[PDB]
Each structure stands twice: as C-alpha cells, then as structure tokens.
Design a protein around this ligand. Structure first.
Ligand SMILES: NC(=O)C1=CN([C@@H]2O[C@H](COP(=O)(O)OP(=O)(O)OC[C@H]3O[C@@H](n4cnc5c(N)ncnc54)[C@H](OP(=O)(O)O)[C@@H]3O)[C@@H](O)[C@H]2O)C=CC1
Ligand SMILES: NC(=O)C1=CN([C@@H]2O[C@H](COP(=O)(O)OP(=O)(O)OC[C@H]3O[C@@H](n4cnc5c(N)ncnc54)[C@H](OP(=O)(O)O)[C@@H]3O)[C@@H](O)[C@H]2O)C=CC1
Ligand SMILES: NC(=O)C1=CN([C@@H]2O[C@H](COP(=O)(O)OP(=O)(O)OC[C@H]3O[C@@H](n4cnc5c(N)ncnc54)[C@H](OP(=O)(O)O)[C@@H]3O)[C@@H](O)[C@H]2O)C=CC1
Ligand SMILES: NC(=O)C1=CN([C@@H]2O[C@H](COP(=O)(O)OP(=O)(O)OC[C@H]3O[C@@H](n4cnc5c(N)ncnc54)[C@H](OP(=O)(O)O)[C@@H]3O)[C@@H](O)[C@H]2O)C=CC1
Ligand SMILES: N=C(N)Nc1nc2c(Cl)cc(Cl)cc2[nH]1
Ligand SMILES: N=C(N)Nc1nc2c(Cl)cc(Cl)cc2[nH]1
Ligand SMILES: N=C(N)Nc1nc2c(Cl)cc(Cl)cc2[nH]1
Ligand SMILES: N=C(N)Nc1nc2c(Cl)cc(Cl)cc2[nH]1
Lengths: 251, 249, 258, 250
C-alpha cells in the first residue's frame, strides 16, 4: 500500500509542485493550506481524479501562538486519519515580507508569522511526526540559498530560515536512531512573488549564472523527490542548494 | 562624556565578565537581569564604587510574548534614562536546556529558548537602532551549533537565528555606522548543575589546553569587537573555542 | 574522431580513479544509466582492465581505460588533456567528468619527501581536477556537468592530514569557481561529500567499528553505491538547475560533536 | 627580551602595515620579500632607526617547486639567525591574477605561483615554524570573498580555500604545542596598483560600512588582536574584516 506525505502550504506554487510530484511518484498526500481553500480543494480534486482516495486537505494557521503545538499535532493527525500512516513531511509553508529595523502589522504579529511559519511550526510538526512513529521516513525543509547574503530589511525572515537550518541539523542528529532522515532544499530565486512586476522579475533573473532565469517549481520539487527517494537513503542533515549559482555571485 | 552599554543577562558568569570589562574600559553599563537580583545589585554596587554613577540594573523577562517588544524598548530606554546615550548593546542573556523531539509545556520551551536567544535580541536591536561615534552590537553566539548537543533543537534554532540576525542587522545598520558582530564560545563556564566528572569530559575535548574558556577570555573578544581596532568589522562572528569545533566525533 | 564512436546515440563520461571502490561504483552506475565511460587509473591496471572488460561484455565498446599519474608535475597538464582526449577518441564527446581520484595519507607538521607529499596530495585532490576541468571545458564542441568528490569532514579534519584537507578545501573552491565561470556554457559543476564510506579493506574490523559507531544514521559507513547515487542525481535531468552545490552523503557524521 | 615575527610579503601594502604594527607592539621583525628589495630595505631602515637591531630582510620566491621546502625553512632560519627565536608567523605574501578555464604565463607557472604562494608556502612555513620550536601563533591572510569568487580566478580561489583548510588543520595539530593558528580575511582593502579611479570607485561603492575599502592598518589591527594576550583561547578562527561586503547579494 501507498506511503503518505504531508506538504504544508501546498495549495499553490512550490508546495503544489511538491504535492503533485509526490502524488505522481505514488504517495497519498495531505494538502495543508491556510487561506487558499479553493485552490487546495481544486488540487485535491485533480489528484483524486487520477487515483481515488489519495488526497485530502487540511486547514491550519502556522502563526506562532500558544496553540500552534495543537495545530501542528492536528496536521499530522489528519494524515493518520485519512491514510493510516505518515511517511514524509515537507515543511514548505512560509511567510515572507520585509520587517525593517528602523522606521500595518504589529511587530508582535511580524515575529509570530515569520518565526512561526519558517521555524517554530516546522519544529512542532517534526515533533508530532516523530512521536507518531516513536519503510522510508523523512522530512524535507524548504530553506533559502541566500540567507548569508540577505535581502535588505528581511531580518525576521532570515532569522526564521537560519533557525530552520538549525532544526534540519538538530533533528537529523536526534531522529537518525529512529530511521527518520531530515534534509533541506534551498532555492535561490524560483517562482517570483505574485505582486512583483515583470521588470523587477527580470532584474532578479539576470543575476542567475545558470541560464539567467528563476528555477521552475518542478525543479525545486525534483530535489525534494530525490531526498525522499531510496537514492538518498544515507543522506541526512544535508541542505541541497537549487539556485543556478545565484549564491556564488558577488555584489 | 563616557559611552554607555547595555549587557543582557549580566548579573553572573559571562555577562558579568563582559559588563566588568566594558566598565574597566570606560563604559557606563546597564546590567540587565531576570532572576538574579542580589547579584545584579551587588555588581552595580561594585562598579559604582570604582566610578560613581556608572552602573545601573534593569530587570526583565526575555521570554517571547506579546509584551516582549515593550520590555525590550524599556531595557534600551533604561540606558537613556540613566546615561543619556546608548553606544553598545551586548545580547548575552540565554536560556539553555534540552527540548527532546520525542517528549514546562512545549509552548513555554519555545517561548523561553527562542525568546531569549533570538527574538529578544531582534527587538533590542530594533530599539537600539531606532535611537540612532562608535556604535555597535555584539551577539553571543555558539561555536558548536553545526555539531549540536543531542536534544537541544530549540536552543540550536535560537542560536542559528541569532547568526541570521547578526548578518541581516550588520547589512541594514551599516548605513548608520552601527556595526553588528558575534562572539561564539565553545565551552566556557560549564553549567552550575553539572558534576565535575562531566565537566572534565568536556574539558578533555578541547585541543588548546584541555580546559574551558574563562569568562574573561570571552569578554576579551567582545572588547575587541566594540573597540576602535574593529572599526571595519561588521557581520563577523569570532569563534573563541580553543579549537573545540574542529574536533571530529 | 574515428568512425564508430556512436557519438549520436549516447553520452560519455570520464571517471578518475575508477578501477575500484567508489570510482568503480560511479562508473558502473553511469554505464548502467546509458553512459559510455573512460575508466582512469594509476596503479590498479588489472582491476581497471577487468572492469572495462565486464562493461564491454554488457555493451560492446562502451568502456575504455586510460592510465595517468595525477601527481603534480610539469607534465600533469598534458596528462590531463590526454585523459579528456581519450574520451573524445573513443566516444566522440565528453558530457560528464567525475573527479574521484584521490591520495589520502597523513602528513604531520611535526618514506616520502615533503615535496612528494605536496605533489601527490595537492596534485590528485585539487590540481588535477582543475586541469581536467580546463580540458573538459575547452574541448566542448546537452546536459554537461562535472562532479567533484569532496569530503564532508573537511571542517573537522583527521589529525595530521593537513595536505589532504588543503586539497579537499581547494576542491570546494574549484567547484564554486568553475560553477560560476562555466555556467554560461551550460556546464554545471557540483560536488558529493562522503563522510565515512568504504574503509580500507586492510583496516581491522575493530577500527572500522570505531568509525561506524560514530554515524547517527544506522551506525554504518556508506556503501560505494550510496555515494554513486548522489553522483547520478547530480548528472541527471532532475538536477538541471543545480550548480555550485555540494551534497553531503554522510549519514549525519558531520553533525556529531567530539 | 623582545619576541620576533616573520611577515611574508612585508615590503609593501598590507604586509608592510602588519610588520610596522608588530614592530610598534614591541616585536623584532623579518621582512620577507621577493622582488621588492628596495622597499624591504627601506622599511627595515625605518624600523631600525626607531629601535636598533630589530628588523632584517629575507628574500625568497614562494612559487611552488621541489625547492620550496628549503626556501621556507630558510625564511624561518633567518628569524632564528637574527633574533634567536621566532614567536609569530604571518602568511601574507600572495599572487593574485586571473586564470580563465576557457581560452604569457604557462598553466604550469599559474598553478605554481597561485597555489604555491597562497597555500603550499604557508603550509611549509608552518611546518618549519613548528619544527624549530611564550605566546606562539600563526596568522594566515585569507579572503572574505572566496565563496562569492571573482570570475576567472579559480586557481587563486583554490589557493585561498586551501589556506582555510591549513588554518583549521594546523590549529588542531599544533594546539598541544601551544601554537595558535588563525586567519584574517579582508574583503576589499588596498586595491590593485593597476586599477584606475573609476574601477576603484565601483568596488568601494559595494561596501555597506562606509562605501570604502579597508585601510592596511585596519587589517593589521585584526592581526595584532590575534597574536595578542587578548586572543589566548582563539585558534582555528578566521576573522572577516570586510565592512559587510560578503553579506551583499548580486
Ligand atoms: N519562491 C522562491 O523564489 C523561493 C522560495 N523559497 C522557499 O520555498 C518555499 C516555497 O516558496 P513559495 O512557493 O514561493 O511560497 P509562498 O510564499 O507561495 O508560500 C507558500 C504558502 O505558505 C502558506 N502560509 C503563509 N503564511 C502562513 C501561515 N501563517 N500559516 C499557514 N500557512 C501559511 C500559504 O498558504 P495559503 O495560500 O493557503 O494561505 C502560502 O500559499 C518557502 O518555504 C520559501 O521560503 C526559498 C527561496 C526562494
Ligand atoms: N557557557 C558556555 O560555555 C557557553 C555560552 N555561550 C553563550 O554565551 C552567553 C553567556 O553564557 P553563560 O554566561 O553561560 O549564560 P547563562 O546560562 O549563565 O545565562 C546568562 C543569563 O541569561 C539570563 N536569562 C535566562 N533566561 C532568561 C529569560 N527568560 N529572560 C531574561 N534573561 C534570562 C539569566 O539571568 P538571571 O540569572 O538574572 O535570571 C542568566 O544569568 C549565552 O548567550 C550563551 O548561549 C555559548 C556557548 C558556550
Ligand atoms: N572512502 C571514504 O570513506 C571517503 C572517500 N571520500 C572521497 O571519495 C572519493 C573516492 O574514495 P575512495 O574510493 O575511498 O578512494 P581511494 O582511496 O580508493 O582512491 C581512489 C583512486 O584514486 C587513485 N589515485 C590515488 N593516487 C593517485 C595518483 N597519484 N594518480 C592517479 N590516481 C591516483 C587510485 O587509483 P589506482 O588504484 O588505480 O592507483 C585509487 O584507486 C575520493 O575522492 C575520496 O577522497 C571522501 C570522504 C570519505
Ligand atoms: N588587497 C586586498 O584588497 C585583499 C588582500 N587579501 C589578502 O591579504 C594579503 C595582502 O594583500 P596585498 O597587500 O594586497 O598583497 P599584494 O598583492 O600586494 O602581495 C603582497 C606581496 O606578496 C609577495 N609575493 C607575490 N608573489 C610572490 C612569490 N611568488 N614569492 C614570494 N612573494 C610573493 C610580493 O612581494 P614582492 O613585492 O617583494 O615581490 C607582494 O608585495 C594577501 O594574502 C591577499 O590575498 C585578501 C583580500 C583582499
Ligand atoms: N515564502 C517565500 N515566498 N519565500 C521566499 N521567496 C523568495 C524569493 Cl521570491 C526570492 C528569494 Cl532570494 C527568497 C525567497 N524566499
Ligand atoms: N546560555 C548558555 N549557558 N548557553 C550555553 N552554554 C553552553 C555550554 Cl556550557 C556548552 C556548549 Cl557546547 C554550549 C553552550 N551554550
Ligand atoms: N581518497 C580517500 N580514500 N579519501 C578518503 N578516505 C576517507 C576515509 Cl576512509 C574516511 C574519512 Cl573521514 C575521509 C576519507 N577520505
Ligand atoms: N594578493 C592579493 N592582492 N590578493 C587579493 N587582492 C584582492 C582584492 Cl584587491 C580584492 C579582492 Cl575581493 C580579493 C583580493 N585578493
């Protein structure tokens, strides 16, 4: 019978690409979403049309709060309720916006969203995933190849992504005895923000050595699929950059 | 007039040594503390005896919460209230304990470890910057975060976040002339609760002298980074670890 | 290129140090994937010829051997050009270069002269990869890539292995520099960094176990095939946006403190 | 009596600033040079005018060859010959020029010069320094930008990455002997002599902290810290002195 995966923030963009590629590889999938209900259900419908009873949706806010542990436990529970097992967790959901140090969401909200989605929710999901297995089990964290050459005024986002690197390493060490591998995929520029104009998109594209273009969502998903596959059975604690050389380019 | 520094978690151990060395170099100091009231006041007394009106205390919990931004603003404000300026911030305060992935409530663990090690440094950095010469921030990092202790996920997340803050803030505050750097101890003062046998197991791992760093040795690197000898240094993290991070399993 | 290269039908790869162990496993997996291969070797002539024979028995004239010493010297550039040349001679193209050959032995700071130590360790681990990379790039006449065999433990090195560690760090530098410079030609350059994989056959099991016990994921060394799996990924169509990346394949070893 | 230091490539630029600051701190100095004989002697004269018998020059080519071990042993010997001790080694000398992968110096020469000066000579000097053995330490001049390299500088980058490996390996191995090994990694400091004003300004404008290059003295200040009593627990560390340059994305 088929293994099952949870993908967070899977309604659109890179998370959808990961969900689709896992499903095409033979996984049953939980499509987690927050606000994108119509898109999430649309995706689940397409996947169920291909193979009945292979996709469910699960709504949760991954903002930090005193109930975030319960929400994370519930996402994992939803995989077990639907499919009776949970083999793979992909921590994809992410808030991304500037938080200038020097001078509209309050700073409290900023911290809760950016640190919650990028770091604390992955940690709590990792706890819940592990405790339900306390076979090819693994976790893949969506990192960021540019966190050592950060965008100006993105402190909280960068803190969150650096914390995610720390989680990837700490959890790899601690979960290795349970046979759970923990790895990361670090895009450079992939799908550009919906709000961004084409001229600004091209500015980013022209910086990439390998082809002067952003990664497709499928290219990111290809790295995730490698890491969950049997071809990566000895790999844990690794972060694979998928950035077209962007992080090698000086100012 | 004498420049002023805020040191978090400065009542004891490494934070105390930093406060003392900054004071000896000529700074007026805010000694932040959480629970160690007696030690904080005794330190302020000791420093004030050397030079009148050069040390104060400020109590605050740096656990993450919706009131933490206000608390951090008040820590910076305490420096301005006492000394009229704030030239240096040292983010030293830190919770440190294991948080196993397979298990205080988890939300308390998150609040304490990510609050003290990352979120409070960010909020303090924001408050410090909003006010603003030789201005700089020094973050107390950890040389061993890429080879972490088993079951310290939250602590390690907080310290990695602190590296990210050091880099992002260095970039963003450079236009204002505020340098932002880190000092990364390996093993320095070992936990008060740790038996000597276990302490010795750690000491034996250190290539340079088979001993932990004194608090003074960590403070020496902080002093360098705040000094005129480090005027072009920003976004750097200086390991002070006796080669410990070089030693394989 | 002499007629009968079948250059239109299949890609070709050079694997250095490919007679045994990890290099052999890489050559075998590339061959199994559909590549023709050059098996480079230095002293392991019987093993290299035997391997190429077995591959040719599977699919005729899909493997050749090329002997070269990769020690640094004033003839090393010519030796490296000849290795790349041998791929073009045999197969009419060279799509992949795997820099696997490596000398590995202690060189304490406090029988071989120091100059031999430098020549062997820096030659095999760094200079020969550089010269092979140059020859590979210049000869380009499409999924082209280079994979460099790095070392996951180069930031926590074995005691008294300074020259080896210097060589492996230089190889990281080459991976990054070549990724940037060759990207406009569509050549990707990546690395695979084992931790502990196949240990010396001669090493006592009791010593092997000292290393195995350090590995979080399964308390075992990687197989050569597990290392080769990462090389296969990097050369594949599933890695077409990946350049300048080094994939650790170490079972968590590099995460373990002293 | 005064400790002694060897500074490689000390006749000009950053190595000169390092030698001066060491001398000002009370060290006797060996000013190594290769081509810059007049400058080396000029510096030695200035330092000896300040304190008699505290500075000597030593000529050596640090290009890789089968006699490079002997040359490095001789540089260390020169310090013992002059001063009777050698407490500090600063590996500063460095070749720096492009070596494109795709097409008057042969590739053999390019390898020998770039890998020799930046990596192999530091290793051999480290070996000789250790073998010939207060507060002993080695400082390696690294490069803050080696993970975001200039186009077509592969051999230089290989050399500087090897130098990081040496710094780490030698710190581990020499720690039981009380020898610390550290590095200082400039970003942009003194710009190339050949570079015109427009190009120099292009590079200056990239640096977040002050939109200027490091002075040689700023680089020297970090070397001084690393050899000082204020760094006695520091080994295997590389201090970036780059004004934030390495933090700036494309
Ligand atoms: N795109 C790129 O170029 C790059 C991406 N990455 C990383 O790759 C991953 C995927 O990137 P991308 O597809 O662009 O991501 P998006 O910005 O599209 O975000 C993915 C999803 O995150 C979910 N999310 C946001 N906030 C919350 C919240 N508070 N609670 C729960 N879910 C939330 C949203 O779900 P919903 O819509 O249902 O509300 C959103 O659709 C992210 O981790 C990202 O940081 C890294 C570098 C570059
Ligand atoms: N000691 C070592 O070997 C190492 C230390 N470091 C780093 O160096 C720094 C100093 O280390 P060390 O002196 O051992 O630190 P301690 O563990 O002694 O903690 C320093 C102070 O942090 C304060 N603190 C703890 N929790 C809170 C909280 N919730 N709110 C506010 N303040 C709080 C405490 O103040 P109070 O007592 O007043 O309650 C405590 O005295 C830390 O950042 C640490 O992570 C890094 C690696 C190794
Ligand atoms: N095995 C492990 O645990 C680890 C391996 N690695 C790396 O992975 C790669 C493969 O490892 P492994 O299979 O153990 O390597 P080996 O030690 O088996 O060496 C591979 C081959 O290198 C060739 N070689 C050595 N010296 C020279 C020379 N002077 N000129 C030409 N070729 C030479 C030899 O060819 P011949 O026999 O024909 O003379 C040898 O078979 C290496 O790059 C290694 O550093 C990294 C970390 C750990
Ligand atoms: N300047 C900068 O912006 C940066 C410098 N650095 C590093 O800092 C250090 C100092 O930089 P800088 O002052 O610019 O260095 P230079 O480029 O000025 O070189 C210093 C000295 O190296 C010596 N040298 C060169 N080739 C050889 C050789 N074959 N044998 C012996 N000595 C040789 C020369 O001695 P002579 O003149 O006597 O022949 C030269 O004066 C170097 O390691 C450099 O890589 C790193 C990043 C940036
Ligand atoms: N959640 C996200 N959209 N994260 C994210 N999106 C990113 C983009 Cl469009 C570019 C870079 Cl350089 C980093 C990015 N991180
Ligand atoms: N707040 C603290 N005491 N932090 C801290 N303390 C530490 C100790 Cl005694 C050892 C290591 Cl390796 C890391 C440490 N981090
Ligand atoms: N050429 C080699 N055999 N390289 C090599 N072999 C290695 C082994 Cl057997 C263990 C570790 Cl830690 C590193 C190694 N590097
Ligand atoms: N020997 C040298 N001059 N080395 C050297 N010089 C350098 C300069 Cl003027 C800039 C950068 Cl980014 C790196 C450099 N490395």
């Amino acid at each position: 019978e088929a293994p099952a995966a949870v993908v967070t923030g899977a309604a659109k963009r890179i998370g959808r690409a990961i969900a689709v590629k896992l499903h095409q590889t033979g996984y049953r999938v939980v499509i987690h979403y927050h606000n994108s209900a119509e898109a999430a259900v649309s995706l689940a419908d397409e996947l169920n049309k291909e193979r009945s009873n292979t996709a469910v949706v699960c709504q949760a806010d991954l903002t930090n709060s005193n109930v975030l542990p319960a929400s994370c436990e519930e996402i994992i529970n939803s995989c077990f309720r639907a499919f009776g097992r949970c083999d793979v967790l992909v921590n994809n959901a992410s808030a991304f916006y500037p938080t200038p140090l020097v001078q509209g969401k309050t700073v409290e909200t900023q911290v809760a969203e950016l640190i919650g989605t990028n770091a604390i929710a992955p940690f709590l999901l990792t706890m819940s995933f592990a405790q339900r297995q306390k076979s090819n089990l693994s976790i893949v964290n969506l990192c960021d190849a540019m966190v050592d050459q950060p965008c100006m005024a993105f402190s909280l986002y960068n803190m969150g992504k650096h914390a995610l690197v720390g989680l990837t390493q700490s959890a790899a060490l601690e979960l290795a005895p349970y046979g759970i591998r923990v790895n990361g995929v670090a895009p450079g520029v992939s799908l550009l923000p919906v709000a961004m104009g084409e001229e600004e998109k091209d500015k980013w594209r022209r910086k990439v050595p390998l082809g002067r273009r952003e990664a497709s969502a499928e290219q990111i998903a290809d790295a995730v699929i490698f890491l969950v596959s049997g071809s990566a059975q000895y790999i844990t604690g690794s972060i694979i950059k998928v950035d077209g050389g962007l992080s090698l380019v000086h100012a």
